[PDB]
Amino acid sequence: EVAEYHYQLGLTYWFMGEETRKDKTKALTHFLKAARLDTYMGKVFCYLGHYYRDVVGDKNRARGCYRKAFELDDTDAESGAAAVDLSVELEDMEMALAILTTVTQKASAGTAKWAWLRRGLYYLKAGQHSQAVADLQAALRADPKDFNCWESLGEAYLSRGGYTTALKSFTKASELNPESIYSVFKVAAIQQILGKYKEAVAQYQMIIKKKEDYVPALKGLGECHLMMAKAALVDYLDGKAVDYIEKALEYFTCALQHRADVSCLWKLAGDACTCLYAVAPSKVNVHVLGVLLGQKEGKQVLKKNELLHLGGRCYGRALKLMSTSNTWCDLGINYYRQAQHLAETGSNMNDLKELLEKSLHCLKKAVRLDSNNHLYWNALGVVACYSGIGNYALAQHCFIKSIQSEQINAVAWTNLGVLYLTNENIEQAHEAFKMAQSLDPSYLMCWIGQALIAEAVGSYDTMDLFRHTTELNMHTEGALGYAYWVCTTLQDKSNRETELYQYNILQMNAIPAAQVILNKYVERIQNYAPAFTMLGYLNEHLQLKKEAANAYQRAILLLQTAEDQDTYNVAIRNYGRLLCSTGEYDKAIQAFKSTPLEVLEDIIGFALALFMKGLYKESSKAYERALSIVESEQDKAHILTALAITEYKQGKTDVAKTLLFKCSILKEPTTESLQALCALGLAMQDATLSKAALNELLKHIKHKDSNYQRCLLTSAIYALQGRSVAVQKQISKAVHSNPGDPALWSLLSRVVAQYAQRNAKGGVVAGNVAHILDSNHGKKALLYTAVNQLAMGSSSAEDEKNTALKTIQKAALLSPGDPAIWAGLMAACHADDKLALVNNTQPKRIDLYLALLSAVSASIKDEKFFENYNQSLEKWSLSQAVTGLIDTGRISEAETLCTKNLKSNPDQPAVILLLRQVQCKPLLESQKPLPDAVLEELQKTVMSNSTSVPAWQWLAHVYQSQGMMRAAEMCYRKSLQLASQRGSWSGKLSSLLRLALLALKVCMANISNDHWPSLVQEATTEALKLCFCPLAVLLQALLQFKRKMGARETRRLLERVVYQPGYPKSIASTARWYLLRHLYAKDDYELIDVLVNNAKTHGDTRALELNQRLSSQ
Amino acid sequence: MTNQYGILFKQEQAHDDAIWSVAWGTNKKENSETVVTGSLDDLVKVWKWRDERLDLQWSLEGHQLGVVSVDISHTLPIAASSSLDAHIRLWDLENGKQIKSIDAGPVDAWTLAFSPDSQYLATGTHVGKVNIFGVESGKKEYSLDTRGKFILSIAYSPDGKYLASGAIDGIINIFDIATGKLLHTLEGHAMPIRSLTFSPDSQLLVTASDDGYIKIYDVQHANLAGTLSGHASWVLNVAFCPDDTHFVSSSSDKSVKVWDVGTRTCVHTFFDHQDQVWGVKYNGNGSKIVSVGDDQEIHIYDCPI
Amino acid sequence: MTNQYGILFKQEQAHDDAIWSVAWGTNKKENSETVVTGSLDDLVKVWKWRDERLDLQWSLEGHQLGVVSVDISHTLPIAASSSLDAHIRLWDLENGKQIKSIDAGPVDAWTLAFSPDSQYLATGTHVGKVNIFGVESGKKEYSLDTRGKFILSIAYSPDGKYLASGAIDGIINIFDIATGKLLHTLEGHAMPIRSLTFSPDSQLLVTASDDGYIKIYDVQHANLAGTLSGHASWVLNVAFCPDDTHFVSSSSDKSVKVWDVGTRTCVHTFFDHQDQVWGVKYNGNGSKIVSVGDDQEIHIYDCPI
Amino acid sequence: NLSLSELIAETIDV
Amino acid sequence: MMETERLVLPPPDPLDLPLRAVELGCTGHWELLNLPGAPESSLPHGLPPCAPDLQQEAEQLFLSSPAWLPLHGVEHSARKWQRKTDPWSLLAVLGAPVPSDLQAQRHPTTGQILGYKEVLLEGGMDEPTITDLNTREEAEEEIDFEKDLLTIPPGFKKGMDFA
């Protein structure tokens, strides 16, 4: 009768095995007798519970037993848990909750994990998210850190709305046990919810990597791609939308492979299929793979109608699996879209009635299922008012019902306003649109309706309303309206100063916005020929001729199957004009052939294209036909001018002259005819007809607003007569008259660079001012001032950052397209080398001549025609490159260049002279006698290309270097005579100075036959008469010192040269040297000290060196 | 009622090209009557009207482009000239050899004007400022700044403390010498001014514009006293008489007209100068008028008091 | 609503002449902040912005003419530069001594651009091709060919497989690196481009032209997203933000403006840089802006996220 | 100093 | 020319130094180096070509072609277009939101995810011939759309009437 012994024997039989548990006579009998002998041994009732639970199955009594066990021992979590679990299995939730509450009320601090989990899971199953949240925090603070609680907390936090601590809980669950995927999926779901679809897509791809069959990830990817496609469709990007739709459909069918019973996937597939409506037919071709198209066969390509049919099928399947009003309305909308597509293309009519009936039935069923949704009512109304049905009473009823269902309904209000507006109800349509605008300030359709009403009433702010509408959300109607209004406003030519054209078309920059608007519109619709012509016209205004030609071509293709009287012929003519403007003369001729040549415009365009291609006779014939047709006399005068131009192009200048005279005799001359006559007179050497035409232009023509052209014509008039000085005077007068107009300053700089290049400082100043005055003239201005600085030499304050090299580099940076800049760069590099040699510090910028020559040739090759100027440019560039290579010491490269040039074409004297110099650089560098045969060859080659001073000076130098004083003197005299005859001035001075130097050298050799001093004196006197040459006065001083030596006068002359300011450093140094010499001969120590300190105030070393050297005799 | 007017002197060919500026200076206390002209050349030749004729005295040169402006001082014997050459070189006018030479481009100085005490020799630049130099002292000590377009005219009041400035597009600015702050800007015309002048005991400012009108404004306020419209072409230069009763204007229609401020009418017109006239000036006392034109001719007239 | 913008740093005289190019590179993982500039000289001086200022570190040279373009790599410490000297010499950027030297004339290479992996260093030539070299590997391995005029700009997408190129007369060409075939040509403008740049996760191409307009095109198609017209003079350089929300443009009217792609409007403008601005760049994160101008000054601004 | 009218007349005559 | 050679002494003399001249620019500016050799003149061949002469320039400005005449301009065509409007494109329709979220399940006690089942919010899978026929099967509200229709909009005195 010991309860404990009976208990332990019962346990023994329980643990012996399943067979002893199944024998009812041992386990049960001992547990029941023990429980009868001692009723407080709760564990015995617990074990009776286990026996009856697992062997007998009487759950209700078992629950009661576990309850008594827990009442006897409230620490037995096992009995309590089993009682709760059986109560939940018995649907007795009140007892389970009472137990759980008693436990958690006694659990002051944790130690109730099982009960917290029970209550939290139960409340999560129910709609009690707040209580579930509370229980989850308590369970989490219980002590266990397992994920299964963190994930529950995160899910409840997401359910209530919080997005921060949910992410924290999901992150914690992932970090403590990564094997779970649900937490990462929920993180990606949160990322998707708050926009930023791309990050969610990346997370979903990463999740799908590890496991390829997770349905939620495929659904998320499909939804993200659908939303991105819709966002792309908000703008006008049809290709992006189509690609996103295809990807979303692929993901949706991939998910449907695994779970085919889910209405969500079917409805999402239907939505994706039907989303691509009213998007550029013949641009939608979608790849759908596998099971969707009947039998599983690879991948197939579907069109718009097939895609819509597939969407309808998917909607039907989703409806079959789940009947909901939302899917009914979606099916109705899908059928409505299908009917719209069938009607739009004109494929059929009156055979779409079945689709409309199906859509109406589905929408009516949906709206009757729940008559409290503004969406269903509005959809029913919109579908009812379709042109194929036209049930306006039902549409009005549905719109009123949708308005009544929810007060803030801008869509229904604007639909009602549109219905009233199209049925001639301006006032009430305005009222409804105003109501919609007040209820929603950022709705586009109401604004478009207001703009349409304003246009229908003829207001003044219709253009501004359309512009604001286009700026807001890029809708098609506002786009077309704004484009049409801008084109019409531009077309009228009497508005130029009415302050409406000015403000409308200049401060708002209407043309580029209209161009972009029309591009988007033509992308969306692409079946409107007027839109194509408007786009072409706008592109013409923007100098976008290729786009204009393409638009005209597409308009032509669209318009071929039309009435063809005005639209198609004008399209052909515009396409031909644009095509001719961008080369393609044969295509322009063909385009102008395919039209009736009975209108002035077509005939004149044909004539211009013919002239551009050639065929001057046919051009003249067409111009004569236009002249026969012409009216609007200004046009007749222009036709006469064109006829004169083409006649001149055929030679035969007399008939062109008579045509221009005929144009002049007309009642009122035109500026173009007079300018053409003056230029034609300039082309010939008459120069008197040009003066008369210029007088005519000056007399009674002032409305012309181009001072540059008139100044250029006058300058050319003056330059033709060979004066060459009055050009600068005329341009200076023009600049004085108009201090602005940077073109005049640039012209002045260029003209002083070319003619009369002695005002080099003025030219540099004019170029700098022209560059300052504006920005787009900087290129030419900098080129001209660089050349003027090159002409000056080094007549500055030796300041950096302002030399010809810097300015030419700036010009090269501004526009690296012309060859003259590269040639000037070569010249500047050579001049800098010479300057560095003079200063004797370092040679720099040694070897770039080949690259610059190649650049010059490449940039020359791409100009239309400047033949003589191009030839001179290429000759100068080649000669300068050869000379620079010779100077630097790359004789082999120079010889290869010369040989290639002479192999390319038969010989020309300049290149043979260059080759002679190349060959003769090595020989005679070191002292060596040369055969008289070589001397005769050199003399013959110099004779080959005469009338060039450089070659004569070089041959004189060669003669002197070998030694021929008479021959060198003769050559210098010949060069002097040639330079004086040819009108040059620098060459005359150079010849004088070179002859003086040679004769002074020969006199310094103390030779007899004292005629060389006479030559020195005459040359120096002539040079001094020419200009103020410090070198000439110094040569005079050297000769005078050599003769007398002792004579006091010589010291006076030397002191004048060394003491008068404005002299170069080297000449002053030489004069100082000889003055010190003369005074040391004259033995005056005070003057020697004066010389020493004078040398010390300036910078010198040689004078002080010789002073010290002769001080210590 | 209109007084007797006679030329009494015409020069055949003073220079070789168009004459752009002229200055008449009674600088010394005795009868000097020095006339300096500049004409589209380096030549700044100085003439003298001794008793009844002009005798050429100096042919000083050293410019590279056409000289656009010349000026003479009334206190010391000195002269100044500027050109498109970007060089303001002032001559001695007694011995005539290149006393100084200042570097300033057309973007730094356009026209010349001596100070009432002959001390500053201000000029005007493209960027709108009024560069003030210092004679015998230094270069570019300061410049008054206004935010505008090319400036053409610079004028000094005969008592100081004022400085007017006309510009292209017609905007007129007035500065005070004592402080240098912009007092008030006058809209003026819609065309370039290219001519300004004050009056003795200065209370009147006379403006000439490109549209043919001549405005008479009043300093120290923005009230305009009237508009004189008698010319047919551009008005190029305007000089005021020593007594506040008349002023002479020269236009581009080959006509020299003299107006009167009291009644605002043209008392006389001279029909000479077959081509444009670029300069007119008065002498010390209002008895003779000098005028140089686009044609190489110098005309002297006679206007009795 | 407009965020607070401040300079926080102005350098007085970085170089002796006009500055033509600038590159900002956060190459190393830690805070390097390397800035390389080239300015009408042999000097390719390398600066570093350590905490609040710029400190000069290298003054490396060895060019003969003005350097027109410089570029820096983000993976390895290296730099490259080209000039009118017809020499592409790439520097070490750590010791800065002439790692290599490539011969290429103005008829062979104009501007520089490193590969996303810093391996090819493509350039553009006069004849229109796009020469692609190889760093550390060789010279002139291949060149993409287009039939057009002088080419100025060369741009790489930050993920590869794309290469844009602007040219004189406005024709824009797009190539794919994987194959090298011309995908599609955009007519663009009627004036030279001289500026191109992609965006991260590249789907937008922003072009700047010589007429003042800024086009926003969409890659993989020919759809243009809009035209931005706020500048008054030539637009010279355009740089994109690390996040696709803003981009900075520098024009020739002495104004640096920052736009936003989402709404197509100018959020802020900086009125500094009294002369033309030749370069603007962003740093690693979109907080600071560097800008070099025709005047010898380096300006750094601050743009909050 | 031949003006336009004289030139036209002379050329027309010849 | 005589072509008599004239031999000059080979040493100049140390006591006196040679005369080597150099020319700088077109507008006369010479100078003097110490070191005997080439004449060394800068820009030996002249200034470069620069721009063409004014006669060619005017010949090209006008006598190139008649394309610069205003009779071949962008104006002088008198174009015109014809305006079409389309109110009906201003209708808008919205789509109903999805009616289910496909919410996960949980094991009761020791919360674990057994699977995913679709919850409502508040054979031969190729979709063959799924269209719906034989409508009007359930009773939803028995609404009548054919007899009594609204006419008066809210806020509005009278309504547009259609036969």
Numbering used by the authors:
A (entry chain B): 452 to 1564
B (entry chain D), C (entry chain C): 1 to 305
D (entry chain E): 451 to 464
E (entry chain A): 1 to 122, 157 to 197
Give the published text:
The helicase can extract mRNA from the ribosome and is expected to transfer it to the exoribonuclease core through a bridging factor, HBS1L3 (also known as SKI7), but the mechanisms of this molecular handover remain unclear. Exosome and ribosome thus work together as a single structural and functional unit in co-translational mRNA decay, coordinating their activities in a transient supercomplex.
To favour the open conformation of SKI238, in which the gatekeeping module is dissociated from the helicase module, we purified a complex that lacks the SKI2 arch domain (SKI2Δarch) and assembled it with SKI7SKI. Cryo-EM analysis of this sample resulted in the reconstruction of the complex in the open state at a nominal resolution of 3.4 Å, revealing a small unexplained patch of density on the convex surface of the SKI3 superhelix. To build an atomic model in this density, we used the knowledge of the protein boundaries we had obtained experimentally to inform targeted predictions with AlphaFold-Multimer29. The interacting residues between SKI7 and SKI3 are evolutionarily conserved in higher eukaryotes, but not in budding yeast, which diverged in terms of both the general structural elements and the detailed amino acid sequences that underpin the Ski3–Ski7 interaction.
